[PDB]
Amino acid sequence: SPHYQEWILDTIDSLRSRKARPDLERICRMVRRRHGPEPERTRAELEKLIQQRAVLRVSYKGSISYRNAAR
DNA sequence: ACCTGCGCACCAT
DNA sequence: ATGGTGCGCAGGT
DSSP, X not given: OTTHHHHHHHHHHHHHHTTOOXXXXXHHHHHHHHHOOOXXXXXXXXXXXXXXXXXXXXXXXXXXXXXXXXX
16 A cells, blocks of 8 residues: 555554554554554565664664654 | 553653 | 653543
C-alpha cells in the first residue's frame, strides 16, 4: 500500500501521544487493528523505513524504541 | 481482552 | 537548567 509509511509514522506518533513505548509489538499491534496487515508485513515495512532513515531504532531506558525521524 | 490518559522520575544536552 | 520519554497504573469500551 502507498500509505504504509504514513500508517507506521502515525502509529509511532499515536503511541508517543498516549505515553506508551513505541516498540515493535505495539507498532505491529496498532497497524493490524487500524488497517489490517499482519505483523510480518509491518515488520518488513518498518525495516524499509529504518534503512531509509525515516524511522530510527534506538535503545532507551533498557529497551528498544522506534522514533519518527521527522520529529 | 481491547483501548486511551497521565504524573513525574529519568535521561541526553 | 532544558525538553523529550514511558512505567505503572487508572479507567472506559
